[PDB]
Design a protein around this nucleic acid. Structure first.
Ligand SMILES: [Mg+2]
Ligand SMILES: [Mg+2]
Ligand SMILES: [Mg+2]
Ligand SMILES: [Mg+2]
Ligand SMILES: [Mg+2]
Ligand SMILES: [Mg+2]
Ligand SMILES: [Mg+2]
Ligand SMILES: [Mg+2]
Ligand SMILES: [Mg+2]
Ligand SMILES: [Mg+2]
Ligand SMILES: [Mg+2]
Ligand SMILES: [Mg+2]
Ligand SMILES: [Mg+2]
Ligand SMILES: [Mg+2]
Ligand SMILES: [Mg+2]
Ligand SMILES: [Mg+2]
Ligand SMILES: [Mg+2]
Ligand SMILES: [Mg+2]
Ligand SMILES: [Mg+2]
Ligand SMILES: [Mg+2]
Lengths: 205, 56, 81
RNA sequence: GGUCCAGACUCCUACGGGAGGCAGCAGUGGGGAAUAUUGGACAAUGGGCGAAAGCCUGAUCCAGCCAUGCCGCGUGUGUGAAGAAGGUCUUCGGAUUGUAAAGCACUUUAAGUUGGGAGGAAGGGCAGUAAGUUAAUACCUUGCUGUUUUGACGUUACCAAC
RNA sequence: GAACUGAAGAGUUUGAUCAUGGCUCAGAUUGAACGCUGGCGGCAGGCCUAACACAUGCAAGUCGAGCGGAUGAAGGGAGCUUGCUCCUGGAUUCAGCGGCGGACGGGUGAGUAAUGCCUAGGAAUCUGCCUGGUAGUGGGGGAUAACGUCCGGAAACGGGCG
């Protein structure tokens, strides 16, 4: 399945930016993002430790747009792997094909990059892939099919990704829309607000 | 009345004259074909029972 | 007698074969005496199409083991290379 | 899925007299909360016989049914404040459903239609040639060469177009 | 170079407290069943109960290059005349004798508490077809199925003689 619906109540409930719109205009001047959704919005309601852990996990899942069973699989694989599962989970989440296409500026958001990947418009090693879970390895060359290189979507996505910050782990060849995955981005390459310790704490119970 | 049957090549259509349960071969239905042709190995929908004909 | 034949594994429409030395009156995928390699009808990429132990195959052929038709053809092909 | 004897139980009968054993694959009644098709082919791997074509094979390879499980993918994407109409609550000020909808503009995965299209195939028949066996350019065995011939699944996986 | 790395508590006895102690809950699993709902595919699974009773199909045959016999093509012809007869030859097919197979493959878990299973040992045996050596295949005899014949039986079929 997939979460299809209002993609801004999630930001208000989580209480952070949690990028889900294109970021073109703003976030504050679309939803008054200071109240939880629903009738009881003005209430604050300090919550418990289990609530904090649940909110952290939900925030990560809604950032990357994956459901619970696939996320449990990701956690099990991160625990199986060596070296501190806490950032192993982020390493593994940051290597999905839709996320990589988003980071390369081909799509405005994760939903639009999923739209592109699922609709057979992306080739990884010169051959078509349409699974928005394909773990891209270091050194792959994500490109755009020639019959799909004239879509405007890519044009606006690129010109708007031009100003959001330098990822500095993928090299995009802007003129013909070809990328490159140098390596997985380390923990210091991501925002230092996610407390993955809460996620590991939640699942270890 | 001229007793026109339409085509015999239509899908079979008939009515149940009687029905019984046999201990060796299950429910057996005596049906009168009204039009069309009924062939062995055919999906049949009768009342609320459905199924396909092992034998005829 | 004692024969050398192909035991089928893998999955639906994706067959893999083990070259097995068996008493002839056993199940195709039942008990065996020894496995002396494998055969891959699809292979491709880094997978090898077939591999056999020359030493074990010659030893068992010297002890009076009758290979099947496919085992004979594949073994002579492996000996060719 | 052989013989003999005895037994319980079903059945035939022309009333003299015989037959049967699905805990093989389908299938039925019954019990139960509850568990599926009287399917196709020996094309592949095996087994029996044969000298060899070849015959047999409910093993096997496959199809049918059932969200029973595991895994993966869809049910769209961006913009959009008159913060529309309706609903709900209200301190009657308004808040919320909510960028949610409508509007505008994009995309066609899966499903639908059309057209291409592998891999599962080893072998067999015939014809020729060369070696070994003898006593022999015979028969036969073995290398190779040419020609012909094989797929249930199957409207295959996959690919392209609307 | 790896073959691991790993351990949470909460509610409830009292006016309140500490302890003891039971009950209950948060997790992971099913050959699952039921209720509501239901788009697709890949890979698996599917009588756990009555080892209850079974209608109907199929699931074990093959060898004519072991042996008689009867079925007897195409042809070469011969005669008469459009087609028949006859002969020589004879290709195909098998009811019977005989050789192998049927002790495999497939199903089920009733019995069994030890003649079973698991682990480690050993001594007094056999083993079709298969592999490698050694020595041979010389010469007679009496039968019998099939078949012809004679009766009985509704049939299944049975009996005597050559
Ligand atoms: Mg799922
Ligand atoms: Mg039986
Ligand atoms: Mg059965
Ligand atoms: Mg029984
Ligand atoms: Mg019942
Ligand atoms: Mg059921
Ligand atoms: Mg076969
Ligand atoms: Mg024959
Ligand atoms: Mg048969
Ligand atoms: Mg059949
Ligand atoms: Mg399904
Ligand atoms: Mg259900
Ligand atoms: Mg209103
Ligand atoms: Mg082919
Ligand atoms: Mg109290
Ligand atoms: Mg049972
Ligand atoms: Mg015969
Ligand atoms: Mg068995
Ligand atoms: Mg038992
Ligand atoms: Mg006892």
């Amino acid at each position: 399945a997939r979460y299809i619906g209002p993609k801004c109540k999630l930001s208000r409930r989580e209480g952070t930016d949690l990028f889900l719109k294109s970021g073109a205009r703003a976030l504050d001047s679309k939803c008054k993002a200071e109240n939880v959704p629903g009738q009881h919005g003005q209430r604050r309601g300090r919550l418990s430790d289990y609530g904090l852990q649940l909110r952290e996990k939900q925030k990560v899942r809604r950032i990357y747009g994956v459901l619970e069973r696939q996320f449990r699989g990701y956690y099990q694989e991160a625990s199986r792997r060596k070296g501190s599962t806490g950032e192993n989970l982020l390493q593994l989440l940051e290597c999905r094909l839709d996320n990589v296409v988003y980071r390369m500026g081909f799509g405005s958001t994760r939903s639009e990059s999923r739209q592109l990947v699922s609709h057979k418009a992306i080739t990884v090693n010169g051959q078509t892939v349409n699974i928005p879970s394909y773990q891209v390895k270091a050194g792959d060359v994500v490109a755009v099919r020639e019959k799909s290189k004239n879509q405007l979507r890519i044009a606006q996505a690129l010109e708007l990704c031009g100003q959001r910050g330098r990822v500095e782990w993928v090299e995009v060849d802007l003129d013909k829309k070809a990328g490159t995955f140098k390596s997985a981005p380390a923990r210091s390459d991501l925002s230092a607000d996610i407390n993955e310790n809460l996620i590991v704490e939640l699942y270890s119970k | 009345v001229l007793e026109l049957k339409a085509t015999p090549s239509a899908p079979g259509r008939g009515v149940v004259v009687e029905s019984r349960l046999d201990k060796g071969r299950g429910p057996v239905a005596t049906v009168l074909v009204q039009d069309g042709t009924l062939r062995q190995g055919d999906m049949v929908l009768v009342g609320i029972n459905y199924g396909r004909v092992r034998a005829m | 007698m004692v024969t050398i034949r192909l035991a089928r594994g893998g999955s639906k429409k994706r067959p893999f074969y083990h070259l097995t030395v068996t008493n002839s009156r056993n199940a195709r995928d039942g008990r065996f005496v020894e496995r002396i390699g494998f055969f891959n009808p699809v292979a491709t990429g880094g997978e090898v199409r077939l591999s056999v132990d020359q030493e074990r195959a010659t030893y068992w052929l010297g002890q009076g083991a009758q290979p099947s038709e496919r085992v004979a053809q594949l073994l002579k092909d492996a000996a060719k290379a």
